[PDB]
Amino acid sequence: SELSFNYPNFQSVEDITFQGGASPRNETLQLTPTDSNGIPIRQRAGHAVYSQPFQLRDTSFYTTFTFVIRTTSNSPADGFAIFIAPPDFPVKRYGGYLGLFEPNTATNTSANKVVAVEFDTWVNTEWKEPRYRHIGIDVNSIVSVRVTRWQDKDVFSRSIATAHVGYDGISKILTAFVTYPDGGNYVLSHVVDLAEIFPGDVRIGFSGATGQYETQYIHSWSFSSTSTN
Ligand SMILES: *[C@H]1O[C@H](CO)[C@H](O)[C@H](O)[C@H]1NC(C)=O
Ligand SMILES: [Ca+2]
Ligand SMILES: [Ca+2]
């Protein structure tokens, strides 16, 4: 179906739903909570999602957002993701589950219905993932179906980075481009039929988790979807 929205900043959150530890702060979406001294709270997850459901049958979309990873040490955890799931998808487990999965089914593709582009700051040993920080496409599992190295210079840049995520409903391809000002660029694509996974309504949004020593912020976000008939 057709949907568009545009948040150049978040001084309005009229159509954003906050769950778990996410909240609106300083004109941004703050995905995990900080204490009254500004210190990242361990072992929390949060979601900030566009509140209106849409459908993926016969649909393409384009979305872009800007984000900042704020770290307070060289060992930040866990990262965040932009995700699509059903409208009643709740905040799930903190830590390396990124607010998207739970321990007993996190690698079981038959037990999950969620697609995401993840920005993963902590190399987990509890499941298979690369030995470096990485950006990944996830389809119904915390073990990414496509993954690439995310350079530490960019992770720790303090820069406002830009993501572009697009879904071609004809070819059934999900693509992320991530760019850093005077830094790295990243390209990831995967063939996946999102209408087959999600035959009814979905919501799109963000999920962040700690971990430790990290806070994730979304500074702007826009979206457009269009029919492919
Ligand atoms: C355990 O804690 C580290 C931080 O010390 C990371 O958050 C990691 O993701 C955690 N492991 C799991 C399985 O969540
Ligand atoms: Ca990962
Ligand atoms: Ca991880």
Task: Explain what this protein looks like in three dimensions.
- The protein is mostly beta strands.
- The protein has one domain (1-229): Sandwich (Jelly Rolls), CATH 2.60.120.200.
- The chain is built from 2 helices and 16 strands.
- The strands form 2 sheets. Strands 1, 3, 4, 7, 12, 13, 14 and 16 form an 8-stranded antiparallel sheet that branches. Strands 2, 5, 6, 8, 9, 10, 11 and 15 form an 8-stranded antiparallel sheet that branches.
- β13 (173-179) and β14 (185-191) form a beta hairpin.
- The structure holds 2-acetamido-2-deoxy-alpha-D-galactopyranose (A2G) and calcium ion (CA) (2 copies).
- Residues 118, 120, 129, 134, 136, 144 line the site of one calcium ion.
- The site of one calcium ion (CA) has 6 residues, from loops.
- Ca(2+) binds at residues 120, 122, 124, 129.
- Monomer.
- GO terms for molecular function: carbohydrate binding; metal ion binding.
- Glycans are attached at residues 26, 108.
- It comes from Bauhinia forficata (Brazilian orchid-tree).
